Design a binder for this molecule. Structure first.
Ligand code: HEM
Ligand code: HEM
Lengths: 106, 49, 62, 22, 81, 48, 379, 111
């Protein structure tokens, strides 16, 4: 029954996305992830392109952070372009482990 | 052996028979006005008579 | 052409770290004295006659 | 080699240092 | 183990740096600071300043009352009556 | 109450001058070294 | 290798954690508080050992002794006022440290976090006993009322407060104990610090962005030795600014009065670094309830790891917690204020809502905010 | 570390022995290249735009001869000591020394 409410979250979502500064840094949502054991394995599963990309992005980002400089307005990550490229990989890794856990009950 | 060695080293701290000589031992009377109040130090806290 | 003051200073004293260090030892000395002198003066000025140094006269040798 | 000349300015330094510092 | 040859794997990135002696250590500091200082402060202010502001009100009010209630020795209940 | 009153204010004076010479100096050192980093520019050329 | 000084001695290799170590690039000024933290530990110590080179630990003399260190002994005055003020710094620095850990999720390093916590609490003990060494009106009473606050425990308490004191009050017996433990804590604490460092060396320093920097790592020697020296320079600045221009300013207590056991400053309070916990304690009517809640103030730190709810260990990218993080800090400031306040209506009612705010911020608000933010990002 | 090390040592600590051996190496390098027709032709051509119209061949030995361990030490310290390097790599350069490290390698405090 979500037509008005859930077509307006995108409004807070959008707000929120640009609120969090990582937008400005040239980074994307997936690169802001807490690198834990599941993320880690997902990470490892990335293709050369995807994966080298995430290395430059973070390189460019930690460079900016070191210099306290924001990227130009023209070169920023736009919410409409949400590459959730880790998501696919990350899901399974979890999926596998949930299974493993479950299989270990009895 | 541990028990008695540890015990002794804790008791070392517990309360010396120096201090603990004066503890619980106090008397005084009739030397002060039939009216006032004499605050003695007794056991570190004020002993009011 | 001549070497900028720094270049002069450089080639005479800072190439060799022995010299450099020697410098610094020397400098530390010279500097301490000037600083003090200057910095003490400055401070006594701000309290003219407020300090015993100014006030010894009164009861000294008659 | 260069060690005398260097050991001679290292000598000096120590000397000046003590003299002054102490 | 070894911390420098074993951190991660990085392909295709060039870096270009310059020597200290070739550059200046203070790059239009006034000019960058103002605009950068300005631009981050203004993105901080909103997230940071509020709660402090709040405390100040609470401090102010909170001390007024005290002095009143206590200096207003007649505050609780009046004199005449 | 505080017999050191005058000496301490004296030293203050000498600690303030000194510190005004060391704070700026030392900052320059800090930029001298870091400069390579801050001046640094980056390029990313995949074969892709 | 041959004649690589560093790894030749095995010992000198162990020192290459300073020079050669992987240190992230990006790194707020906040991290200099680690290093300064050590700086302060070393300064207190050198200072302590000289003061304890002219201090005596008896009722009779202690006040005199300090008084004599500040009068007849050459440069004993600065040493002592440097030692007093230092400890302020030491704490000012500590609370920056823990702020940073709170904010950027450095506390993910659970094992490092747990040592920190021990660190924090050990210093806390130290500071509590040193202030009592001089045996002045504030010190005297402050020890009684804190120590006695331990007698809240039902079965033991009472017996136990009496063991700690070495008698029924706080006479010589207690006074020499604090002298000995004050002396030996800092040495024990240094071991801890190094143990803390040990664990941290196994995963390196987190950043403002909150992401691994392994793809960006820098020489600690080249860069971070100057930063640290610079940090010092400012640190000292503050310590001498305080110590030279306003020796007593930060040392609220004006009680340079030899302790008279019947006398009492109606306004009894710990120094600034303890006020938070004081306030929080008063807010509870019941004694025991207040001691538990006092411990929980400080001891609640070790929970936060488990409380973490977001996917971004970095608060840097998360608004809502950045707002409640700041508020807690300002709530903490608010509490510190109460500490020096008459315990009357105005302050009572305030403190009580601040003590609930603090535990909400830490126990309930933040954790929820985490979730929310995660859900707005679609995470 | 070893290389830069070698540089430094060179301009502070060169020993006549050492320089004399390198000396001789040079001669040979410089004589043996000139074996064959092609080789001689290039030296003669290139020599003329480079060094102008001289053919310093026999001079060499003379020039090479003036070599002294002090000569070699003073000549090396113009160009390598306190001077700022030009360093390029094509990684795995992840361990390659930080520009400032390389830089400090051109002077002698320790290492
Ligand atoms: C960070 C660890 C330490 C902290 C937080 C600390 C803090 C303090 C404080 C707050 C005082 C009270 C001074 C006053 O206000 O008059 C004090 C006094 C004292 N401390 Fe320290 N201290 C530490 C380490 C040490 C060490 C390592 C020593 C000995 C080596 C030491 C020896 C003394 C002595 C003898 C006094 C008594 C005289 C005085 O008041 O200066 N302390 N300490
Ligand atoms: C005796 C007091 C302390 C000393 C001497 C000390 C020292 C250090 C030093 C030298 C560092 C490395 C640099 C930095 O990140 O700033 C560090 C890091 C750290 N300290 Fe402390 N510390 C102390 C207290 C604490 C406390 C009380 C805690 C927390 C309860 C703590 C938690 C941490 C954490 C989490 C880090 C790593 C942060 C990161 O880089 O990601 N420290 N400490």
């Amino acid at each position: 029954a979500v037509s008005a409410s859930s077509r307006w979250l995108e409004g807070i979502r959008k707000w929120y996305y640009n609120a969090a500064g990582f937008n400005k840094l040239g980074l994307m949502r997936d690169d802001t992830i807490h690198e834990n054991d599941d993320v880690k394995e997902a990470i490892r599963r990335l293709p050369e392109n995807l994966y080298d990309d995430r290395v430059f992005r973070i390189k460019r980002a930690l460079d900016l952070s070191m210099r306290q400089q924001i990227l130009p307005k023209e070169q920023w990550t736009k919410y409409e372009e949400d590459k959730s490229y880790l998501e696919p990989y990350l899901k399974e890794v979890i999926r596998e482990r949930k299974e493993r856990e479950e299989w270990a009950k009895k | 052996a541990a028990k008695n060695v540890v015990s002794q080293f804790v008791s070392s701290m517990s309360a010396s028979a120096d201090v603990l000589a004066m503890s619980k031992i106090e008397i005084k009377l009739s030397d002060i006005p039939e009216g006032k109040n004499m605050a003695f130090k007794w056991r570190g806290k004020p002993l009011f008579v | 052409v001549a070497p900028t003051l720094t270049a002069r200073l450089y080639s005479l004293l800072f190439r060799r770290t022995s010299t450099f260090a020697l410098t610094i030892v020397v400098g530390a000395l010279f500097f301490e004295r000037a600083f003090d002198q200057g910095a003490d003066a400055i401070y006594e000025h701000i309290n003219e006659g407020k300090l015993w140094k100014h006030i010894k006269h009164k009861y000294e040798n008659k | 080699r260069n060690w005398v000349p260097t050991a001679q300015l290292w000598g000096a330094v120590g000397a000046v240092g003590l003299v002054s510092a102490t | 183990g070894r911390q420098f040859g074993h951190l991660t794997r990085v392909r295709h990135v060039i870096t270009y740096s310059l020597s200290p002696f070739e550059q200046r250590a203070f790059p239009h500091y006034f000019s960058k600071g103002i605009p950068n200082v300005l631009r981050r402060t203004r993105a901080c202010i909103l997230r940071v300043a509020p709660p402090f502001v709040a405390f100040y009100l609470v401090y102010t009010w909170g001390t007024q009352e005290f002095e009143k209630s206590k200096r207003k020795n007649p505050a609780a209940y009046e004199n005449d009556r | 109450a505080e017999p050191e009153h005058d000496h301490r204010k004296r030293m203050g004076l000498k600690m303030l001058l000194m510190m005004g010479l060391l704070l700026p100096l030392v900052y320059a050192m800090k930029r001298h070294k870091w400069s390579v980093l801050k001046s640094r520019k980056l390029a990313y050329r995949p074969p892709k | 290798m041959t004649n690589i000084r560093k790894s030749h001695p095995l010992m000198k290799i162990v020192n290459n954690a300073f020079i050669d170590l992987p240190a992230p690039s990006n790194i707020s000024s906040w991290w200099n508080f680690g290093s300064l933290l050590g700086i302060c530990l070393i300064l207190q110590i050198l200072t302590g050992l000289f003061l304890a080179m002219h201090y005596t630990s008896d009722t009779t003399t202690a006040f005199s002794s300090v008084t004599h260190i500040c009068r007849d002994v050459n440069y004993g005055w600065i040493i002592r006022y440097m030692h007093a003020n230092g400890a302020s710094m030491f704490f000012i620095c500590l609370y920056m440290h823990v702020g940073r850990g709170l904010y950027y999720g450095s506390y993910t390093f659970l094992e490092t976090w747990n040592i920190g916590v021990i660190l924090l609490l050990t210093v806390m003990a130290t500071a509590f006993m040193g202030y009592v060494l001089p045996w002045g009106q504030m010190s005297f009473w402050g020890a009684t009322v804190i120590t006695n606050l331990l007698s809240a425990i039902p079965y033991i308490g009472t017996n136990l407060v009496e063991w700690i004191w070495g008698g029924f009050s706080v006479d010589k017996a207690t006074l020499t104990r604090f002298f000995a433990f004050h002396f030996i804590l800092p040495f024990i604490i240094m071991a801890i610090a190094m143990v803390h460092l040990l664990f941290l060396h196994e995963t390196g320093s987190n950043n403002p962005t909150g992401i691994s920097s392994d793809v960006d790592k820098i020489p600690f020697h080249p860069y971070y030795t100057i930063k640290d020296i610079l940090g010092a320079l400012l640190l000292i600045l503050a310590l001498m600014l305080l110590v030279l221009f306003a020796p007593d300013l930060l040392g609220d207590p004006d009680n340079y009065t030899p302790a008279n056991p019947l006398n009492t400053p109606p306004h009894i309070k710990p120094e600034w670094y303890f006020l938070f916990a004081y306030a929080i304690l008063r807010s509870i009517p019941n004694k025991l309830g207040g001691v538990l809640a006092l411990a929980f103030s400080i001891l609640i730190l070790a929970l936060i790891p488990l409380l973490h709810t977001s996917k971004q260990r970095s608060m840097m990218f998360r608004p809502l917690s950045q707002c409640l993080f700041w508020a807690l800090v300002a709530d903490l400031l608010t509490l510190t204020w109460i500490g020096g306040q008459p315990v009357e209506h105005p302050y009572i009612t305030i403190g009580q809502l601040a003590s609930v705010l603090y535990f909400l911020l830490i126990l309930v608000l933040m954790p929820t905010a985490g979730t929310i933010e995660n859900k707005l990002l679609k995470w | 570390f070893v290389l830069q090390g070698q540089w430094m040592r060179l301009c502070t600590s060169a020993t006549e022995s050492e320089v004399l051996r390198g000396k001789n190496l040079l001669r040979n390098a410089l004589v043996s290249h000139l074996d064959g027709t092609t080789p001689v032709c290039e030296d003669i051509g290139r020599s003329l735009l480079t060094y102008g119209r001289r053919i310093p061949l026999a001079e060499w030995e003379s020039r090479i001869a003036e070599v002294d361990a002090r000569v070699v030490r003073e000549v090396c310290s113009k160009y390598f000591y306190d001077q700022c390097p030009a360093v390029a790599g094509f990684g795995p350069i992840e361990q390659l020394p930080d520009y400032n490290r390389i830089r400090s390698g051109m002077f002698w405090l320790r290492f």
